[PDB]
């Protein structure tokens, strides 16, 4: 009956000390007559006792969805500690365990290139600015466009794709009106990854 | 299980008359006891007669996989016919079903731009040729690289991404030795998609 789902922190969260990276253990499909769900958290095998279990919430399909949220230290996540959520409930034969961590393997620093649009992309009102980020590991990364300090709206990012040698690459596309690229605005592609200095770099682009 | 998955034909196959496009019904996790799975196959409400059930496979999860494949007309699939696979096995409460067809909607043709390498990237031994394919619908597409008629090995393609307007885009990345880029070789990105004239377009790139 009950299914357990264990979610990692957001990459922008693990990479900036101002933010609060958290692991979330989500139990769904808990019957009405065995609703008491117990949680235990282990960090690299030692039980931790500081997780905040939000009070159960009855779903419209007549099952309880219960959530528990453990906060993690940024150096704990990035040093490769394993997080074991252990969910016990009297609807279960025996308790369910789920574990989560950063990806094993040595970090690799992404190279960041910014490509300008094709000449064939001038006969349009809109134009595509491209940012290639390649050779990074593990694949937790964050890509963001801006110009003149303010963020950009119209950008899309592919998912991280596996190259032959084990590392990852992706592309981010910023659609801008040809006018602004003509005028000469500078657009910037900002990349946040653990293997970067200050965890952040930025590449700029203009006519 | 018995849990049913239904897959569509590969794109390349539905776009050339020479290849054979098949829809593929996969029953993961059949039990050793009562392993007799059955299949039936509806095309737009007409039972068809020519399916090829692959005998068995047996997994290291002491359970079985039972694939049936059904071959399809190229115009049948491109015209949006529904392909109904129905699975009868006594271990199931009642017959399972699944359906598949092409994404509904007006096919939109891809725009194909090729981007040269970044100036930054030329201080390396290897170099990334990029190919942006954008504006296409439905998202079944094929992308390949070639030079002097002969194919390329070292290219990877991102899966297709949804833009705000309902079309898709992707990038292909070919990794070549900076020496070949300078000798002046001509590299070609070849796109195969059902909205293109002759289902095929091709863009070229050189120093
Ligand atoms: C009864 O209802 C509840 C709740 O639904 C609510 O009420 C009903 C009535 C409807 O109106 C609902 O629409 C309504 O919202 C049902 O609860 C659902 O249960 C299903 C499964 O039964 C769960 O599916 C899983 O979803 C996860 C991803 O979930 C994230 O994204 C969802 C949107 O897509 C979002 O709704 C989720 O809440 C969650 O969002 C994240 O939440 C965390 C914490 O809150 C947060 O930190 C994140 O930031 C946030 N993200 C976003 C984007 O918002 C999905 O990953 C699961 O897929 C995995 O598991 C499958 C096996 O179960 C497997 O087949 C998949 O392929 C995939 O497998 C994983 O694969 C990776 C590799 O890619 C591998 O590494 C992993 O090991 C592997 N994992 C596992 C476990 O195998 C899965 O699809 C829903 O999340 C859940 N919804 C909610 C809201 O809780 C309940 O099921 C209903 N009961 C029924 C129908 O009987
Ligand atoms: C015990 O063993 C078996 C055997 O597998 C073994 O275990 C796994 C974990 C691996 O280690 C294997 O190496 C190993 O062999 C396990 O059985 C598996 O269980 C998982 C659990 O979810 C199933 O996942 C499903 O996968 C299919 C897609 O399967 C393709 O890709 C897989 C990854 O490459 C690959 O394994 C398959 O062979 C298959 O490959 C395709 O094959 C076709 C021909 O058949 C070929 O033409 C294609 O080219 C090829 N493609 C690729 C990419 O390789 C996926 O469809 C399922 O997703 C649906 O259902 C989920 C619910 O379970 C749900 O979360 C998903 O979101 C999705 O649901 C749909 O979502 C869409 C999208 O939004 C939505 O619109 C739809 O409404 C919704 N529909 C439905 C009906 O849900 C799912 O992800 C595996 O199929 C299954 N078998 C294998 C071989 O993995 C078993 O789990 C093991 N026990 C464990 C792990 O505890």
From Swiss-Prot, chains A, B:
Glycosylation sites: 61
All residue ranges annotated as the Ig-like domain in the record: 2-101, 110-206
Name by which UniProt lists this protein: Immunoglobulin gamma-1 heavy chain
Coiled-coil ranges (or none): none
Effect of residue 199 to R: Enhanced ability to activate the classical complement pathway
Cysteine disulfide links: 25-85, 131-189
Residues of the full protein shown: 239 to 445 of 449
Record function comment: Immunoglobulins, also known as antibodies, are membrane-bound or secreted glycoproteins produced by B lymphocytes. In the recognition phase of humoral immunity, the membrane-bound immunoglobulins serve as receptors which, upon binding of a specific antigen, trigger the clonal expansion and differentiation of B lymphocytes into immunoglobulins-secreting plasma cells. Secreted immunoglobulins mediate the effector phase of humoral immunity, which results in the elimination of bound antigens.
Constant (C) domain: annotated segments: 1-207
Superkingdom, taxonomy of origin: Eukaryota
């Amino acid at each position: 009956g009950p299914s357990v789902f264990l979610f990692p922190p957001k990459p922008k969260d693990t990479l900036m000390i101002s933010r609060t990276p958290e692991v979330t253990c989500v139990v769904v499909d808990v019957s009405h007559e065995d609703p008491e769900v117990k949680f235990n958290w282990y960090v690299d095998g030692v039980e931790v006792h500081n997780a905040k279990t939000k009070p159960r919430e009855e779903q419209y399909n007549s099952t309880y969805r219960v959530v528990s949220v453990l906060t993690v230290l940024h150096q704990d996540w990035l040093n490769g500690k394993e997080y074991k959520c252990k969910v016990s409930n009297k609807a279960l034969p025996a308790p369910i365990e789920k574990t989560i961590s950063k990806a094993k393997g040595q970090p690799r620093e992404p190279q960041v290139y910014t490509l300008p649009p094709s000449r064939d992309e001038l006969t349009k009102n809109q134009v595509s600015l491209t940012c290639l980020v390649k050779g990074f590991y593990p694949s937790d990364i964050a890509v963001e466009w801006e110009s003149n300090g303010q963020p950009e709206n119209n950008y899309k990012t592919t998912p991280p794709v596996l190259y032959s040698d084990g590392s990852f690459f992706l592309y981010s596309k910023l659609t801008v009106d040809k006018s602004r690229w003509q005028q000469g605005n500078v657009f910037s592609c900002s990349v946040m990854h653990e293997a970067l200095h200050n965890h952040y770099t930025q590449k700029s682009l203009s006519l």
